[PDB]
Amino acid sequence: QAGGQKCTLSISVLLAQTIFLFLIAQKVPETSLNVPLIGKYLIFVMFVS
Amino acid sequence: NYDANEITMDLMTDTIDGKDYPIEWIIIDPEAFTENGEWEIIHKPAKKNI
Amino acid sequence: DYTGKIMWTPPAIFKSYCEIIVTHFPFDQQNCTMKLGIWTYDGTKVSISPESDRPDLSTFMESGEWVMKDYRGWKHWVYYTCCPDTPYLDITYHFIMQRIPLYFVVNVIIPCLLFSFLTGLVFYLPTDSGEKMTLSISVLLSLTVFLLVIVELIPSTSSAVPLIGKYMLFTMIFVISSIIITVVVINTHHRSPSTHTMPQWVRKIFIDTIPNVMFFST
Amino acid sequence: RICFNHQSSQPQTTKTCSPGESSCYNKQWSDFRGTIIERGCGCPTVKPGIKLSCCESEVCNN
Ligand SMILES: *[C@@H]1O[C@H](CO)[C@@H](O[C@@H]2O[C@H](CO)[C@@H](O[C@@H]3O[C@H](CO[C@H]4O[C@H](CO[C@H]5O[C@H](CO)[C@@H](O)[C@H](O)[C@@H]5O[C@H]5O[C@H](CO)[C@@H](O)[C@H](O)[C@@H]5O)[C@@H](O)[C@H](O[C@H]5O[C@H](CO)[C@@H](O)[C@H](O)[C@@H]5O)[C@@H]4O)[C@@H](O)[C@H](O[C@H]4O[C@H](CO)[C@@H](O)[C@H](O)[C@@H]4O[C@H]4O[C@H](CO)[C@@H](O)[C@H](O)[C@@H]4O)[C@@H]3O)[C@H](O)[C@H]2NC(C)=O)[C@H](O)[C@H]1NC(C)=O
Numbered sequence: 001q002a003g004g005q006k007c008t009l010s011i012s013v014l015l016a017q018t019i020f021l022f023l024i025a026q027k028v029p030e031t032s033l034n035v036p037l038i039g040k041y042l043i044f045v046m047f048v049s
Numbered sequence: 050n051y052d053a054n055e056i057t058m059d060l061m062t063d064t065i066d067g068k069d070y071p072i073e074w075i076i077i078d079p080e081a082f083t084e085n086g087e088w089e090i091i092h093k094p095a096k097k098n099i
Numbered sequence: 100d101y102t103g104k105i106m107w108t109p110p111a112i113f114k115s116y117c118e119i120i121v122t123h124f125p126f127d128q129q130n131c132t133m134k135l136g137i138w139t140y141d142g143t144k145v146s147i148s149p150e151s152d153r154p155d156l157s158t159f160m161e162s163g164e165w166v167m168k169d170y171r172g173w174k175h176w177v178y179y180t181c182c183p184d185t186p187y188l189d190i191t192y193h194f195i196m197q198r199i200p201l202y203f204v205v206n207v208i209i210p211c212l213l214f215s216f217l218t219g220l221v222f223y224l225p226t227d228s229g230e231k232m233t234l235s236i237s238v239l240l241s242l243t244v245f246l247l248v249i250v251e252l253i254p255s256t257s258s259a260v261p262l263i264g265k266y267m268l269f270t271m272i273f274v275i276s277s278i279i280i281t282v283v284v285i286n287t288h289h290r291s292p293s294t295h296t297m298p299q300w301v302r303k304i305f306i307d308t309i310p311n312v313m314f315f316s317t
Numbered sequence: 318r319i320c321f322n323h324q325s326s327q328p329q330t331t332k333t334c335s336p337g338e339s340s341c342y343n344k345q346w347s348d349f350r351g352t353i354i355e356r357g358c359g360c361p362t363v364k365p366g367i368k369l370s371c372c373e374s375e376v377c378n379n
Contacts, residue, residue, distance in 0.1 A: 001228065002230075007233055022247050177353065179350055
């Protein structure tokens with residue numbers, strides 16, 4: 001109902017994951033042969049969110 | 050390395066039809082020039098200053 | 100050798116200038132050249148000739164970001180009007196390189212897809228709950244914070260708009276249009292009869308036509 | 318159809334244009350060393366700063 005903030009909480013967790021994308025973006029190698037494990041896990045959690 | 054009484058700087062000259070003119074600009078080959086991704090040249094003068 | 104034949108093979112780091120086309124980035128193909136010649140001599144004093152038609156890539160270390168498609172070298176003769184029979188020579192090697200588009204698919208494209216799907220979800224959320232603007236504007240905030248990753252990763256050149264940038268900007272206007280239309284839906288919902296009377300066209304189209312036309316519904 | 322193709326001030330030479338080609342061109346530009354003159358079949362496009370002429374007659378690109 002109005003006041004539970006179910007969307008608030010879920011979309012704010014998505015926003016936090018979007019900040020962790022920039023943080024990881026600054027660290028991962030820039031080759032293109034395989035996808036790193038950290039970036040694979042980020043894609044997973046953002047799809048679950 | 051030398052003063053103006055010993056070395057004189059000038060601009061180079063060309064010839065069109067027996068006449069001389071000074072080269073008052075930067076030279077750019079129009080065929081071998083790849084333009085910059087952010088900057089286009091508008092003017093490119095040259096000057097001897099005293 | 101005892102006949103006077105000389106073979107010299109020195110190493111070098113070549114930094115070459117290359118016209119880079121970014122129209123199709125990150126799925127772009129580049130043609131990059133290395134132009135070589137004798138600097139102070141003309142073709143009547145020192146002549147050059149390529150050793151083979153194609154560059155030597157027998158000991159080439161695989162890249163990780165680029166794939167070598169083709170490579171070839173060409174020799175040129177150039178004459179000037181001032182000197183009728185003096186040629187100027189140069190060998191030009193070219194390399195056609197295709198980019199491997201995975202780093203940029205996983206780091207810039209998939210998030211944009213996700214944000215577009217979310218931008219569409221907002222229209223199934225009822226206005227009775229007070230969270231339509233929260234949802235819409237939070238999607239927009241996430242996209243604005245992703246802009247920081249786009250600006251960190253994409254090339255900041257102004258030769259053309261890349262394809263990845265066209266997609267980023269399509270997503271931006273898609274989100275903003277969703278937000279505007281959400282504000283018009285919310286305004287149409289809290290509309291007080293005391294001040295606004297429903298017109299005949301609205302009561303005809305949105306009560307007696309579409310409801311019936313709508314099939315996939317309950 | 319028949320066009321000159323020699324470079325700059327080289328001994329005159331000719332070529333035969335491909336079936337259908339009604340044009341003929343003369344491209345001139347200068348660099349640090351001097352003036353280059355290119356001639357051939359067709360009416361091509363050219364980067365800005367280069368002189369270009371096109372002619373639909375016969376051996377008229379000299
Ligand atoms: C990626 O980017 C790359 C870089 O941008 C790009 O590379 C380019 O690729 C193309 C091919 O796709 C290249 O084009 C080829 O270039 C060859 C070399 O051209 C130069 O040399 C010519 C020959 O010069 C000798 O012969 C003349 C007489 O014929 C004399 O006048 C000369 O003085 C010279 O004589 C000397 O040698 C003689 C024999 O060796 C000897 O007898 C003599 O005594 C003396 O020692 C020049 O003619 C030529 O100059 C022309 O072109 C320039 C512009 O480049 C003009 O400004 C000039 O005014 C002049 O017109 C060059 O200096 C060419 O040989 C080759 O031409 C042949 O194929 C084309 C195909 O279109 C024909 O039109 C042409 O008639 C030729 O026909 C050939 O047909 C078949 C083979 O196909 C064969 O049977 C026939 O006999 C003949 O050989 C061609 O144009 C281009 O050079 C590359 N540019 C570079 C490297 O910068 C690459 O494509 C890109 N990749 C992509 C996009 O995929």
